[PDB]
A paper describes a structure:
This construct containing the USP14 fingers and the USP35 box 4–5 insertion features unaltered catalytic activity, displays an increased protein stability by approximately 4 °C and reacts readily with Ub-PA. Both a rather high rate of initial crystal hits in coarse-screening plates and the high resolution of 1.5 Å without crystallization fine screening supported the hypothesis of increased crystallizability of this chimeric protein. Chimeras 1–3 showed complete binding to the ubiquitin probe Ub-PA, which correlated with protein stabilization, whereas this was not the case for constructs with truncated fingers. To understand how binding to NK036 inhibits USP30, we compared our structure to the USP30~Ub-PA complex. The superposition also revealed large and surprising conformational changes of the switching loop that allow the N-tert-butyl-benzenesulfonamide group to bind deeply within the thumb subdomain.
The mitochondrial deubiquitinase ubiquitin-specific protease (USP) 30 negatively regulates PINK1–parkin-driven mitophagy. By grafting structural elements of well-crystallizable human USP family members onto the periphery of the human USP30 protein, we generated stabilized and crystallizable protein constructs that retain DUB activity and the propensity to compound inhibition.
Numbering used by the authors:
A (entry chain A): 66 to 101, 116 to 129, 136 to 175, 218 to 259, 263 to 301, 318 to 361, 437 to 502
B (entry chain B): 1 to 75
The structure:
């Protein structure tokens, strides 16, 4: 139901990412308005959102100007994602994936000290997987929850313990969640995290006062293998029918480079998610 | 000055740096605390991955800015 992408030289990290981005129609609409690398990207995503295509021209332009890699090594789809988003920037209007946080730092050791406020800007949320039921909702809750930070206190004139709290200040039309699947072992070595992290078709980002924003899952990039070698595939929604062009299909696809297959939702939800792409309802 | 790095588990560490510090110098300081070799570190600030050979000031990284650290999972 969609074109596959040929794997010329370990390019599944690109193919899988393009398959997922092409399932985000608000991102495609943003790109169309922005273009009214972007055009090279847009033309691929239009084709992939409705045969085998070749995405290598996008990699050629990226290698020329944005990312010094060779043409044939394995790479991280998440690193390519940030190369793409940061190439579009070169804040709100240039960041269709951008989440903003308002942060507050409160000194636990000096009740008189005034809190300081800060801002964080992110184009993906890189969640940590705790030690092993693992759920994306819990990882997200933990990411946004309060944390301890040590920093110099103007009032105490030494390092002191602070608590940082965060509130989401900007909601994007498109959302990329990155489940970190490389951790650092107790032996001082990298470790691939294979554990299933449960996720739903629907995701809610909380806001002040009980307000929140609902998002709907469009695609999942999955990494198979280890950090010495692996393979990326994508589960994505089919394009909508022409008679319901702004609807969201309930048909899912498994796409591994040049091969496209129908997949059940249950297969999608059972997969080992690495990047999850959502759009704001 | 101090900057903060959110590490692989979400714990946020604090580094002592200067605006003229190179990204390599910053990764070395992260290696001192976390044990992760610099060629395995991906550092992100405001969505942009930091490149070796540039300085914190090249990225407008100021006092008490926050970086995110992730590893590189290749396929």
């Amino acid at each position: 139901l969609v074109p596959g992408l040929v794997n010329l030289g370990n390019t599944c990290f690109m193919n899988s990412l393009l398959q997922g981005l092409s399932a985000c129609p608000a991102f495609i609409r943003w790109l169309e308005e922005f273009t009214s690398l972007s055009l090279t990207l847009l033309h691929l995503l239009k084709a992939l959102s409705c045969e085998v295509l070749d995405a290598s021209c996008l990699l050629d332009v990226l290698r020329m100007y944005r990312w010094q890699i060779s043409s044939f090594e394995e790479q991280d789809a998440h690193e390519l994602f940030h190369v793409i988003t940061s190439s579009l920037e070169d804040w709100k209007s240039q960041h269709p994936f951008g989440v903003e946080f308002e942060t507050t730092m409160k000194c636990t050791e000096s009740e008189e000290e005034e809190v300081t406020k800060g801002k964080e800007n992110q184009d993906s949320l890189s969640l940590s997987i705790p030690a092993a039921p693992l759920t994306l909702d819990h990882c997200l809750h933990h990411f946004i929850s309060q944390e301890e930070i040590t920093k110099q206190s103007p009032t105490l004139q030494r390092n002191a313990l602070y608590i940082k709290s965060s509130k989401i200040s900007r909601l994007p039309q498109c959302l990329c969640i990155h489940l970190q699947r490389l951790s650092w072992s107790s032996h001082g070595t990298p470790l691939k995290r294979h554990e299933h992290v449960q996720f739903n078709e629907d995701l809610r980002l909380p806001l002040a006062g009980g307000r929140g924003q609902a998002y709907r899952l469009m695609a999942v990039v999955v990494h198979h293998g280890d950090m010495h070698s692996g393979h990326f595939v994508t589960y994505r929604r089919s394009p909508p029918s022409a008679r319901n062009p702004l609807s969201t299909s309930n048909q899912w696809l498994w796409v591994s480079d040049d091969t496209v297959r129908k997949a059940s939702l249950q297969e999608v939800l059972s997969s080992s998610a690495y990047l999850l792409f959502y759009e704001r309802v | 000055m101090q900057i903060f790095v959110k590490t692989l588990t979400g714990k946020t560490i604090t580094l002592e740096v200067e605006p003229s510090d190179t990204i390599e110098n910053v990764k070395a300081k992260i290696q001192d605390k976390e044990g992760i070799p610099p060629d395995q570190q991906r550092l992100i600030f405001a969505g942009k991955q930091l490149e070796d050979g540039r300085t914190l000031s090249d990225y407008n990284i100021q006092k008490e800015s926050t970086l995110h650290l992730v590893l590189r999972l290749r396929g």
